C-alpha cells in the first residue's frame, strides 16, 4: 500500500521499568489511551507483585 515503511525495528510502547515520580507526573501531565492504559497496567501489575513478594497469601 502507500505506506511502504521499509524499516521496522520498534514497537508502540515499552515501559520496562519506570520511576514513581515520572509515573505520577506523566499520568498527571501527559494523556493518551495508551499512556494511561499502560500506566494503570503497570500500577496494578507492580502492586500485584509487591503483595506477592511480602506474602503470597496462602492458608493450607
Swiss-Prot record:
<protein>
    <recommendedName>
        <fullName>Unconventional myosin-VI</fullName>
    </recommendedName>
</protein>
<comment type="function">
    <text>Myosins are actin-based motor molecules with ATPase activity. Unconventional myosins serve in intracellular movements. Myosin 6 is a reverse-direction motor protein that moves towards the minus-end of actin filaments. Has slow rate of actin-activated ADP release due to weak ATP binding. Functions in a variety of intracellular processes such as vesicular membrane trafficking and cell migration. Required for the structural integrity of the Golgi apparatus via the p53-dependent pro-survival pathway.</text>
</comment>
<comment type="similarity">
    <text>Belongs to the TRAFAC class myosin-kinesin ATPase superfamily. Myosin family.</text>
</comment>
<feature type="region of interest" description="Interaction with OPTN">
    <location>
        <begin position="45"/>
        <end position="47"/>
    </location>
</feature>
<comment type="subunit">
    <text>Homodimer; dimerization seems to implicate the unfolding of the three-helix bundle region creating an additional calmodulin binding site, and cargo binding. Able to function as a monomer under specific conditions in vitro. Forms a complex with CFTR and DAB2 in the apical membrane of epithelial cells. Component of the DISP/DOCK7-induced septin displacement complex, at least composed of DOCK7, LRCH3 and MYO6.</text>
</comment>
